[PDB]
């Protein structure tokens, strides 16, 4: 039951599916009834009740395989919290845009971009695949 | 009732591995076949087609008439 | 000779979690702040 | 090579002393005499203000900033030539 | 005995998701960020010379 | 030039850049194959409750792990070095142009026949004409004849710079006291842009390169007019 | 290398040692579950009878749990092993984890 | 003899990206040639090829600096 | 008592802890600098000033992350803590010299801070190439302070390397051969050999820069017959081994973490792992000029450096596949440390592969001095070295402190960082291929989208860093004391409890020879 | 000269709990105090020098 | 790993305080500097 | 040629160096310089592990050339077995 | 009480004072180079000397006087010294690399030749040859010293060590005189740069090595060394041979081949 820090060098209990029979029993100290049960265990196990069998298991082991292997809802907390902090990050970015960043250059104004786009087409920027290739020079429109 | 038949009990991990490593390989061949076709061959064809009947002087005249050049009006 | 065990093998105290918070705040916060104040310093020169 | 000497019966103190006084120090004495004969001043090289020499990209941290650390007026011209 | 995840996991997931999507959509579309997307199929070219 | 949301290389303007695109395609296919295989095997290792924790013999499997990567490396190196040696071949240039890097602008010298030289500075953002590209335009472009082998010689008169034109596959460091050579051959007329590619101080970001590729006869008249 | 039959026989002999001690029982089971196999019923039978000689009912139940665990997603293996062990379980009065409610999370 | 000069031809002595020595060698060759032609009272025009080549290859500032140093008597190359 | 213990230490654990604290502080400095870079680039235009202030920030970012965060954490911190424990040694060979390796670092860091405060800072790049770093283009004290900072960091690591090599060779149990030492111990020994050989060449090179700047030497000045390119050779002769120095202790920790959380007693193919690290260490010395493919080297030299660089993929692949084979059949524990290690294996592979792309001198013409290089190295550094550091920190924090972290918090931290680093760096491949140069404070408009996304990624990473600090606070605030640790039979460093006593192995382990 | 190593061995092995750098006696303490004072004072001076050099002097 | 329950449990409220203080220690000084960039750049 | 005047270790070695020297002359290893030779390691013939306290860490190299060492505390009392190979070790304090 | 053979060192202030001395010397050099002041540098050099003196003093106390140098500790120090020497070899390698880079491909600024136009190298058959005979001789005399010590011969050890030191001093004074007499300087381009920096660092190492030998001489005088235990002397002899070998490489490369 109670494990002490200063016991680090002594054989210890573990529940691990790959180490089914740990180095020590889960419970070593036995009450009067638990002593009687361990004596009863020396006789036929058919004479042990279901309750006595479970009690013997629980003296030897802490958790069963089903218990130690159980799934949890932890993923929900992890994913939810991560999304929260990622969300919080966007607040920082909103703050930065409002208080730190000034105007971007005038070259991003709609009319500038329209003219710059035509000039890029006039000089046939990336005419093989990248840019002008996607413009229809015969129909004077973007290719479908 | 009837008895349950004896199942395979040995080498379950190794059998799973053998089966899936093939699937890791058979994918790669399927992707390569696709990637070569979707990106690489498409690029080779794009360049081949562009230049096949490409007229550099006509290209220049269009650029010149659009007014892009310092050296040519 | 020296204190042994959890919370004793370190050059900072963990006896009080709030005093610890203040110290960690000053420690990590000073590290993070320094480049911003060096930038401020360089900008204020010329 | 086997040097040209001999011994090798036992490399001990006596042998290494024998080498110290019988080979090593006589060699030093000989080279010292040789140096003492080729000693005396070599002529001062005529000054040419070659741009790959007498480099000054920053003043030296001593003197007038224009003199090298072991400046020898006789053989080390300044960027402007030999000292007056 | 239900642990933290049993009690609050659903809510942390739902709220975290909703908050994250809402704030990122807002930041991306409502505060004047210039993404500079491709002009292809979007911009009508205009005479420049 | 690059365009918005671009994923890959600028379109090739020279045959060597075309070669580089196809070699990148080849290599990236291999990169995608190996990355995906590793990711898949990772996922496979992690998705079973079945266990085997005793000592596993290693020498059989390590053969595959060494030989297959060795083969893949050879399949990368073969076309890699073919291109390397192609770039180094003798080609016989019709023209030699020099460029000198400066803080913060490029000068150009065309001195095969006449003493033609000029400086090339970024157009300030406030002085861009409508449709011109921020940080990319220059006052005086590097006018060159198209469809001709040109020897470009690159140096610097101060700190390191590097002369780059991505769409021609070009990047040659500009080093004081050194004359570095590259070859330039454009398949097409047009305007081809690049930027200083060595950190060189306060306006490193702001000393671009603009090539203007035109027919020989136009290059000749421009040359004469620039004397 | 040795056959499957020879492997199984070694393990049966291991657990069948009349004076096998507690340490050797644990060593045996902890080593066995490291392998890429669910142990044959005959191996498990021998280990369960070792538990009996060591007056250790709990370890017998735990051994049944390990069998189920080593099968992973192969749900057909454990019920077959239990089927094969039923005469031994009846003889020795060993209740399965399921009969004890120990399969509950 | 071989005019219609376009640019400096490939030179097998200097086949690599570093062309510093090519410029240098041709600069040296020209001035060595013109000195040898003046000493014997001959025609400097036989040296023209070296001049064309170094003019094509050499940065203006290098040539200018080297010319200045020849005039100053500080040119470190042997002519 | 405080001064005796913390300023006069001769104890490997306490010195380890000093290094971890120093490295953590440096990490905060490096993170601030990274955020300043991405703030400048987060929208088109100028935020801070021109390229001088910008590249002072970039330069300092690199030096702090490399010399003050990664090396002190991996080698000084984990090396000092773990190496003596893993070989059952009572301390390091030279416990007093060990303390000077530590105390040289705050003065080194102070000199770096000074460099940025005086004049206009050293806006040179972490490579410090002349003539930009020379006394004309960088007049004044900044670059000299940088040189001196590197000198002190260099001496610190050279003496540390002597200490680790001596300790690892000389202080094992007499029955333990070198082929019975854990992989982390191997990784530190090989790293130490790399430091011993490479740092003195850096020291020679930066000293020559110092004399060019102050004693009128002309090693790198063509006016005196010098050559800027000579500096590059000397720097990179150190600089390539340096990146293997940054990753090797990472490889070592990954081997331990993957083994541990797979429930294995041992890594797959131990001698192959040893072979692979030695091969990588050796090959790391014969490849430096892959940093110089555009300087104008002869073609055959370029062919050799292409080929010798690529060959390193072979031993590295052996390690990657051996980690996968270690996972194989594991009882997988999805601990936060395991998550870091799994992220490492994949993301390091990606960065290693883009390294192989760059090894090709022909393609490197177009990729050199672009963001493609920046993408490559942050995959192996921010998603490699750092992932190994975070994995090791989470794994061994209970050993060092005797307290547990909150696993759920640590998983949340991993998730945030993973998203942040990938959002930061993945788009930089696109920027590189499309031609965005390195060391730019501003970019042509076309590059806006990926720079915007990259900068948003950097802010996510910031949130992860801030959370990490809180997580460490929470552990010390709550004081959950460690009880039992699994697999001590194959993880000796745990066997003396958490934390281990000040003096461990006063009585050495018993190991017989048979 | 005479071999006085035995005397020094006795001195430096005295069971007095002193660390080796102070075990020679009062002169160790003096030299230590001189060393630490110069180091700490010098370090303070270096920081003053940094402060001075951090600002222009036109 | 196994461990004892916390010797000095840190409640959700206490964690919210630690988290907030930690975040503010990073954000406020940097925020102050960045907010005032225009003020520095006009000197 | 050749006088004396140089002390020997016998004359002048002190402290721990001297202890190691004198013990080595007696064929003793109190400071664990040598690797102990294994017994058959059965329960009748266990490896005898000296200690100055009531527990000591054992490392077991189970088979020759194993790279993996198996580590455990050996306590005073009944012999304990390596958890990997079962070889027996028994503590012999002081 | 430990039952291993290794040395747990008393907590010590010398690592901190050494580290601070490094700060003071480097910030001091900066002050000297830029702010026309030698004060910080002088304090740094002083604290460095104090640190080295007290640190190595303590190592002597720990070994000769306290007996902490068991065979295992001594073996560690052997490795330590070897590794240190290796690091020093690599440091010099950087300077040899610089020399060969510049000399094998002389730039146009030099006149495209080595030695450069206007450089008048020293005659390698004159004082440089003398210097060579001197250091080679000192390698012979130090080996005599080692064998005398092993054979228990106090007087001949002292005489041989004195001779070795005298030769180190002779080399140093000869080099100092050659520096003064040289018609070229450190500012005479890359020839002066490589010559003075490479031979200068070597000269510094000769001074360090001579100092180490002198330390050994006084320890010997004080009977510290046994006929079997004398690692300080061994380390100084190894360092001395290193200094000799570096000279031989310098002589062949810079003085002879580079002339
Ligand atoms: C920890 C840091 C680190 C690491 C480990 C590496 C590892 C590698 N690096 Fe990198 N690199 C840097 C940090 C690092 N790098 C930095 C900081 C720079 C820029 C310096 C500067 O200019 O500031 C840089 C620059 C750099 C360049 C220069 C590009 C340029 O400037 O133009 C090159 C080119 O060769 C290169 C290549 C490689 C290669 C081949 C590896 C290899 O070691 C990678 C090997 C790994 C793998 C290949 C993956 C695993 C293998 C398999 C799954 C097997 C199967 C694979 C194949 C068959 C290919 N790197
Ligand atoms: C280890 C090395 C390292 C690391 C981790 C990083 C991390 C980051 N880097 Fe950096 N970078 C370099 C080394 C590194 N960098 C180098 C060498 C250069 C080239 C310099 C030059 O060009 O001269 C460079 C250049 C560089 C550039 C290019 C500048 C330019 O060319 O103009 C950019 C731009 O986005 C960038 C951004 C970032 C970002 C956003 C991060 C973020 O991922 C950082 C986020 C935070 C962390 C990763 C946490 C760090 C702290 C800890 C881990 C402490 C914890 C302590 C314990 C566990 C004890 N970096
Ligand atoms: C017998 C030779 C012994 C050498 C003793 C001389 C004193 C200098 C100190 C020695 C250290 C050596 C290397 C430093 C480099 C420069 C000195 C080279 C040796 C020398 O002394 O060169 C002299 C110039 O010294 C000068 O500039 C003055 C230089 C003085 C300032 C030193 C600069 C400090 C540099 C710091 C070095 C950093 C160390 C890093 C350690 C690596 C860490 C890993 C030559 O004199 P000259 O008049 O030019 O020519 C002769 C003309 N008649
Ligand atoms: C101009 C001045 C500025 C430059 C600063 C350098 C100054 C010069 C200093 C010269 C070095 C003096 C070193 C003295 C060391 C004495 C301590 C010693 O030698 O300690 C010995 C151990 O060796 C040990 O630590 C081995 C100790 C190894 C020391 C290594 C010395 C080299 C350090 C060089 C400094 C690096 C500078 C390089 C420049 C790039 C003690 O053991 P034993 O000898 O076996 O004795 C025990 C027996 O008596 C028992 O019977
Ligand atoms: C790269 C990492 C940085 C990420 C971004 C940080 C997120 C923001 C944190 C908050 O920072 C604060 O912001 C306030 C503005 O919201 C500033 O008040 C400023 O503005 C107020 C009014 O707008 C005035 O009351 C104050 O006087 C004035 O300082 C204040 O100084 C600053 O500390
Ligand atoms: Cu010019 Cu960067
Ligand atoms: O360096 O990669
Ligand atoms: Cu590299
Ligand atoms: Mg570059
Ligand atoms: Na910007
Ligand atoms: Na000896
Ligand atoms: Zn064993």
GROMACS .gro file of C-alpha atoms and ligand atoms in nm, chain L residues 17, chain M residues 49 52 56 59-60 63-64 69 77 81 84 88 204-205 208 211-212 215 219 224-226 229-232, ligand 4:
model
   78
 1439UNK     CA    1   4.817   0.644  -0.337
 1565UNK     CA    2   4.849   3.447  -1.326
 1568UNK     CA    3   4.707   2.953  -1.256
 1572UNK     CA    4   4.841   2.427  -0.994
 1575UNK     CA    5   4.719   2.014  -0.765
 1576UNK     CA    6   5.068   1.976  -0.614
 1579UNK     CA    7   4.925   1.485  -0.510
 1580UNK     CA    8   5.269   1.527  -0.357
 1585UNK     CA    9   4.709   1.067  -0.736
 1593UNK     CA   10   4.584   1.311  -1.631
 1597UNK     CA   11   4.743   1.611  -2.137
 1600UNK     CA   12   4.513   1.905  -2.472
 1604UNK     CA   13   4.695   2.260  -2.969
 1720UNK     CA   14   5.440   3.196  -2.685
 1721UNK     CA   15   5.425   2.814  -2.656
 1724UNK     CA   16   5.475   2.850  -2.172
 1727UNK     CA   17   5.780   2.812  -1.767
 1728UNK     CA   18   5.640   2.459  -1.717
 1731UNK     CA   19   5.807   2.476  -1.242
 1735UNK     CA   20   5.959   2.096  -0.769
 1740UNK     CA   21   5.853   1.642  -0.508
 1741UNK     CA   22   5.922   1.383  -0.775
 1742UNK     CA   23   5.979   1.014  -0.706
 1745UNK     CA   24   5.585   0.917  -0.992
 1746UNK     CA   25   5.644   1.242  -1.174
 1747UNK     CA   26   5.361   1.315  -1.410
 1748UNK     CA   27   5.414   1.694  -1.403
 1779LIG     C1   28   5.293   3.441  -2.115
 1779LIG     C2   29   5.198   3.376  -2.017
 1779LIG     C3   30   5.054   3.371  -2.070
 1779LIG     C4   31   5.013   3.228  -2.106
 1779LIG     C5   32   4.957   3.153  -1.986
 1779LIG     C6   33   5.030   3.020  -1.963
 1779LIG     C7   34   5.151   3.040  -1.874
 1779LIG     C8   35   5.239   2.942  -1.857
 1779LIG     C9   36   5.212   2.835  -1.754
 1779LIG    C10   37   5.304   2.716  -1.774
 1779LIG    C11   38   5.233   2.589  -1.727
 1779LIG    C12   39   5.271   2.549  -1.584
 1779LIG    C13   40   5.199   2.421  -1.541
 1779LIG    C14   41   5.244   2.379  -1.402
 1779LIG    C15   42   5.165   2.258  -1.351
 1779LIG    C16   43   5.220   2.212  -1.217
 1779LIG    C17   44   5.122   2.116  -1.152
 1779LIG    C18   45   5.155   1.972  -1.180
 1779LIG     O1   46   5.249   1.938  -1.250
 1779LIG     O2   47   5.070   1.872  -1.118
 1779LIG    C19   48   5.106   1.736  -1.136
 1779LIG    C20   49   4.993   1.668  -1.212
 1779LIG     O3   50   5.000   1.707  -1.349
 1779LIG    C21   51   4.904   1.799  -1.404
 1779LIG     O4   52   4.811   1.837  -1.335
 1779LIG    C22   53   4.923   1.843  -1.548
 1779LIG    C23   54   4.908   1.994  -1.560
 1779LIG    C24   55   4.911   2.030  -1.708
 1779LIG    C25   56   4.918   2.180  -1.726
 1779LIG    C26   57   4.926   2.214  -1.874
 1779LIG    C27   58   5.010   2.338  -1.899
 1779LIG    C28   59   4.978   2.402  -2.034
 1779LIG    C29   60   4.885   2.522  -2.018
 1779LIG    C30   61   4.906   2.622  -2.131
 1779LIG    C31   62   4.805   2.736  -2.128
 1779LIG    C32   63   4.727   2.740  -2.259
 1779LIG    C33   64   4.768   2.858  -2.347
 1779LIG    C34   65   4.770   2.818  -2.494
 1779LIG    C35   66   4.767   2.942  -2.583
 1779LIG    C36   67   4.682   2.918  -2.705
 1779LIG    C37   68   5.115   1.672  -0.999
 1779LIG     O5   69   5.148   1.534  -1.015
 1779LIG     P1   70   5.300   1.483  -1.016
 1779LIG     O6   71   5.389   1.579  -1.091
 1779LIG     O7   72   5.296   1.338  -1.056
 1779LIG     O8   73   5.341   1.494  -0.860
 1779LIG    C38   74   5.297   1.398  -0.764
 1779LIG    C39   75   5.419   1.324  -0.709
 1779LIG     O9   76   5.498   1.418  -0.636
 1779LIG    C40   77   5.375   1.212  -0.615
 1779LIG    O10   78   5.491   1.138  -0.575
   0.00000   0.00000   0.00000
